[PDB]
Write a structure and sequence with these properties.
part of a larger assembly, 2 chains, A: mainly beta, OB fold (Dihydrolipoamide Acetyltransferase, E2P), Ribosomal protein L2, domain 3, seven-stranded antiparallel beta sheet, 2% helix, 24% strand, B: alpha+beta, five-stranded antiparallel beta sheet, 5 helices, 10 strands, binds magnesium ion, RNA-binding, Elongation factor G-like protein (chain B), RNA-binding (chain A), rRNA binding (chain A), Rib_uL2_dom2 (chain A), Ribosomal_uL2 (chain A)
Chain lengths: 275, 236
RNA sequence: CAGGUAGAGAAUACUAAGGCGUACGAGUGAACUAUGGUUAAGGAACUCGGCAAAAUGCCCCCGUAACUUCGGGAGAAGGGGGACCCACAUGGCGUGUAAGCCUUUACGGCCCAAGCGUGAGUGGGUGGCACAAACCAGUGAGAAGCGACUGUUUACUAAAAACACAGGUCCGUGCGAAGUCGCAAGACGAUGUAUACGGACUGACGCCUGCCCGGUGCUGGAAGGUUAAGAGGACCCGUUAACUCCCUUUGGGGGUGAAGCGGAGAAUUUAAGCCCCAGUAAACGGCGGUGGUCAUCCUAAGGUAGCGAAAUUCCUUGUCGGGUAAGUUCCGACCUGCACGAAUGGCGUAACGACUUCUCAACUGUCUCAACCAUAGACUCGGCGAAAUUGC
RNA sequence: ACCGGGGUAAGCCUGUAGGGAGUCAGAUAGGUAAAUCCGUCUGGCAUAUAUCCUGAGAGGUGAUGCAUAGCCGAGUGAGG
RNA sequence: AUCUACCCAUGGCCAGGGUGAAGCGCGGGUAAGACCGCGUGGAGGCCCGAACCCACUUAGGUUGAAGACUGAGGGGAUGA
């Protein structure tokens, strides 16, 4: 849920915080944590390639299992559900009856103590991982692979799920959270159920410093810049034509997906915008 | 305290407004306190030992007095029976006045009401060559008074005032009924005139602060009464 | 590293241990300049402007307004006390030894005279012009504008109304993504995956804008050309002056069109076939009934007055008042058919501001109108000893 | 009445205030091989001021030493 | 990039005094509640104010003590 702060200070007037109801333990597994240092948006050359990034609280990486293929037919039980700075959703900790501890994205409705099983013979309860050919059409899944063996890449953020529309031949037609229809090989794996923290989007951060803790730096508008610095000022926009924005590097609006792409053969349809 | 007497409520408002306006008297209404006194309920003896060695004249004096309960209206009395002149004669006034001040300050806690109708009976005391002093002996007597009062009970007395109630003869029954609930005793209902009746009664002073207003309200202006302190009664 | 006394304090004043008198002096009541101090009577009359000074200042009790986002405003404002001595007081509180009590006896527990420390209060008295006596230590109240707020900014004439911001809208991106740095390899984005990332504009919060699923589009999916009763809660039905033209048949519909007024009750939700309805609208529209407020259903490119959302803005093209003796900001009410714009770019807004403008109280050498005192220079003597400038 | 002293470490003993912690057996390939180790699963016995670990400080020793308030005499300055 | 702008790794600093958020407990209210009082608790780009960081006003300096200072006041001072 969401806990709303009382307006005792202008920094917390309309603010709110995540009511960490689903969290069970406040510390990570020691063996599944890896070091992680910030970069500030600078590439190997040292130049800023992504702007507005830097600062922010120190964080440590939790090793997440996006490649659940090693353990088939080995049941596991969820030990705790806990916090992860690196992603929007919570992470669940699995104790395998085999004796190995792993981390996964916590799906919706998953409580402590449940049994998670993966393979071809697993049930269709939330949290179970199946190859796509064994998943009946019409169910909601998450953490879907793109190529058969490359690890989950799709529908990972909080409160996000995809609808397995159907199967045909070698390809299953899915709908992305964005809303488009995409085909993927039925030999890919996916986890049943949605993703937790559906109430993430309702957080009101409230003050500038709170967003600065999250490693985001302030953005300067283009109009208040000098013509040597930003191509705005010329062309206007507003309500005259369509050159409303120009990127700092001079590029106007338009489709940016590269035409003549291999994966274009797999796209049943693109997403739609504009009511 | 200063006490203002008004006929009723509206006249009281008018006079307070005039005081705060014609003369700028900024005041706030407070409760009126009736006079009260304290009396001894039993007989006891006291012991007062004083030691104070300051930078001027060293003070040290010890006195031993006796107090007995006395009937109301007796006033303060003193009997001295020191043997052999143990305490100096010049300091007998010092002790006396110390005891008078101590009994003026009261004996029932820090809110001790003026103790009255008590006899102090000094019999014994010790003296020093140099440490005897007026103040010393004063406190010695004071502390002897405290020690004497600490051994027996102290009874409080409230002043009952004679109240002459004048109400119409048909309203005498109402006064009998209400004064019955006022812990009042009726000494008679003498016919004031063809309509009103003088009622002889004595009532505690605490009950007479608002007697006039309720009397006039119940009599619709036919109520006239007099008050006059008569004697003192203990708490019921 | 952090002595002592006051003190809340690592502030301030004095001082211990310790360290210094540091490197031109000696004199002299010049003007003048600088830094301090005091000032009769008046009290902002000074001035672009209360610039600068002056003022308030602490503790404890009492008492606190409009407004409000109910947190604030608030230390609002305003009022009273503060020194020393004595008594309560061999009191209270803290600590705790002797003595005593107890136990799983020990580096044990309880109580605890004495000893040491320490407030607060009540009563009486004493002294001064003065009791937060020195140092230290908020000025307060009201109105308008802009920005919601804490922040950032032109190192060296601009700290703001400028930038940022939390919130909002649009567009792009299905993943060695889009974007960016590189000729490339490679890297950041991100050990992230559309509740994510990037770009553009706006800038807390609150409030007023309306009319509706035929065709054609788009979209997801059987809500559906036929549809069971009941669930589903505005209207039609019973009830018509004036009219300029009408359509039907035992009275109702358009134009200038006034008001009115109740109760039987109109479908999404529940079952059978290729085509479909349905969801969405001034983004492909759309401006007309019916009732209101997506309910039978009728209308393709126009953000376009949409509507005529009385908080309206130079709106002295005037009639006035309020504030001052003389009125600026500003505050109120009435005219100006055309001005004139904001409905998503415009009116509101508590709190905040070394922001801009104004009024009041207090206060003062800012002023009427200046005088006097001390330092540091100037000035005199001794020592060392420049500079810009320069046809004569 | 006044002035000046009214000192002494690490280490080594002891283990208090406070804090923390179940224990035994069996099975198991998960930990690039193997494991009695670590994980995981079963049981058995345990809620004890029991036991263990950690742990400021108090106490003992270090210390018959060292240092010190002061007191004596010398003269380059030595000496107590 | 020994100044300065921004970022990255690893350390340090922030006297003193206020106010009193969530949560927890008790009481009232109620069928249950909303909520209301009293205690704990100690939040906050919170308040007053030294160190520390700045630079709003004014006077002086202006061949300066100084190629950007000084004196008085001033802003932030648990946080972007
Ligand atoms: Mg390089
Ligand atoms: Mg950005
Ligand atoms: Mg997270
Ligand atoms: Mg958000
Ligand atoms: Mg906020
Ligand atoms: Mg911005
Ligand atoms: Mg600019
Ligand atoms: Mg500009
Ligand atoms: Mg440049
Ligand atoms: Mg250009
Ligand atoms: Mg441009
Ligand atoms: Mg615009
Ligand atoms: Mg614009
Ligand atoms: Mg156009
Ligand atoms: Mg166009
Ligand atoms: Mg000190
Ligand atoms: Mg100092
Ligand atoms: Mg010295
Ligand atoms: Mg000189
Ligand atoms: Mg001279
Ligand atoms: Mg001179
Ligand atoms: Mg002067
Ligand atoms: Mg004067
Ligand atoms: Mg004067
Ligand atoms: Mg004035
Ligand atoms: Mg003038
Ligand atoms: Mg003037
Ligand atoms: Mg002027
Ligand atoms: Mg000033
Ligand atoms: Mg001053
Ligand atoms: Mg107050
Ligand atoms: Mg005040
Ligand atoms: Mg105020
Ligand atoms: Mg015994
Ligand atoms: Mg015992
Ligand atoms: Mg003892
Ligand atoms: Mg006097
Ligand atoms: Mg102050
Ligand atoms: Mg100040
Ligand atoms: Mg205005
Ligand atoms: Mg103006
Ligand atoms: Mg601002
Ligand atoms: Mg604004
Ligand atoms: Mg600011
Ligand atoms: Mg500047
Ligand atoms: Mg400023
Ligand atoms: Mg400046
Ligand atoms: Mg700026
Ligand atoms: Mg934003
Ligand atoms: Mg945003
Ligand atoms: Mg690319
Ligand atoms: Mg989008
Ligand atoms: Mg834009
Ligand atoms: Mg806004
Ligand atoms: Mg703007
Ligand atoms: Mg604006
Ligand atoms: Mg249009
Ligand atoms: Mg106007
Ligand atoms: Mg005028
Ligand atoms: Mg005006
Ligand atoms: Mg617009
Ligand atoms: Mg406005
Ligand atoms: Mg405002
Ligand atoms: Mg400002
Ligand atoms: Mg003159
Ligand atoms: Mg001189
Ligand atoms: Mg000379
Ligand atoms: Mg020269
Ligand atoms: Mg001594
Ligand atoms: Mg084991
Ligand atoms: Mg020791
Ligand atoms: Mg409290
Ligand atoms: Mg509370
Ligand atoms: Mg602060
Ligand atoms: Mg402030
Ligand atoms: Mg700066
Ligand atoms: Mg000069
Ligand atoms: Mg100089
Ligand atoms: Mg300066
Ligand atoms: Mg300064
Ligand atoms: Mg300051
Ligand atoms: Mg401050």
């Amino acid at each position: 849920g969401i806990r709303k702060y009382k307006p005792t200070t202008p920094g917390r007037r309309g603010a709110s915080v995540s009511d960490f109801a689903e969290i069970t333990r406040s510390t990570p597994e020691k063996s599944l944590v890896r070091p992680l240092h910030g970069k500030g948006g600078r590439n190997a050359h040292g130049r800023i390639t992504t702007r507005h990034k830097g600062g922010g609280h120190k964080r440590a990486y939790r090793v997440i299992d996006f490649r659940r293929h090693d353990k088939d037919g080995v049941n596991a039980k969820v030990a705790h559900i806990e916090y992860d700075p690196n992603r929007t959703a919570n992470i669940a900790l699995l104790h395998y009856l085999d004796g190995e501890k792993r981390y996964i994205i916590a799906p919706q409705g998953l409580k402590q103590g449940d049994v998670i099983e993966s393979g071809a013979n697993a049930d269709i309860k939330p949290g179970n991982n199946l190859p796509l050919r064994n998943i009946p059409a019409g169910t909601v899944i998450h953490a879907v692979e793109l190529r058969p063996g490359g690890g989950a890449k799709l529908a990972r953020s909080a409160g996000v799920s995809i609808q397995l529309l159907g199967k045909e031949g070698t390809y299953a037609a899915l709908r992305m959270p964005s809303g488009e229809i995409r085909r993927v090989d039925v030999r890919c794996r996916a986890t049943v159920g949605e993703v937790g923290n559906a109430e993430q989007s309702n957080i009101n951060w409230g003050k500038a410093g709170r967003m600065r803790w999250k490693g985001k730096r302030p953005t300067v508008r283009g109009v208040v810049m000098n013509p040597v610095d930003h191509p705005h000022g010329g062309g206007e926009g507003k309500t005259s034509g369509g050159r409303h924005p120009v990127s700092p590097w001079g590029k106007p609006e338009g489709r940016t997906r590269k035409p003549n792409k291999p994966s274009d053969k797999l796209i049943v349809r693109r997403r739609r915008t504009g009511k | 305290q200063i006490v203002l007497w008004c006929m009723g409520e509206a006249h009281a408002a008018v006079v307070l407004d005039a005081l705060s306006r014609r003369y700028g008297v900024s005041v706030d209404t407070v409760e009126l306190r009736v006079p009260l006194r304290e009396t001894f309920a039993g007989k006891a003896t006291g012991h007062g030992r004083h030691v104070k060695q300051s930078g001027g004249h060293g003070q040290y004096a010890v006195c031993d007095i006796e107090v007995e309960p006395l009937p109301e209206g007796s006033g303060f009395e003193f009997v001295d029976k020191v043997v052999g002149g143990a305490v100096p004669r010049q300091f007998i006034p010092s002790v006396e006045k110390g005891v008078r001040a101590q009994m003026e300050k009261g004996v029932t806690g820090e809110s001790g009401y003026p103790v009255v109708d008590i006899r102090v009976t000094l019999f014994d005391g010790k003296a020093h060559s140099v440490d005897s002093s007026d103040f010393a002996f004063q406190m010695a007597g004071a502390l002897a008074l405290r020690d004497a009062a600490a051994a027996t009970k102290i009874n409080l007395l409230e002043p009952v005032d004679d109240v002459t109630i004048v109400v119409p003869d048909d309203l005498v029954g109402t006064i009998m009924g209400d004064l019955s609930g006022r812990r009042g005793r009726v000494l008679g209902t003498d016919k004031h005139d063809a309509d009103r009746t003088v009622i002889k009664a004595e009532i505690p002073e605490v009950e007479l602060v608002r007697y006039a207003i309720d009397l006039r309200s119940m009599s619709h202006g036919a109520g006239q009464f007099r008050r006059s302190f008569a004697r003192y009664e203990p708490m019921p």
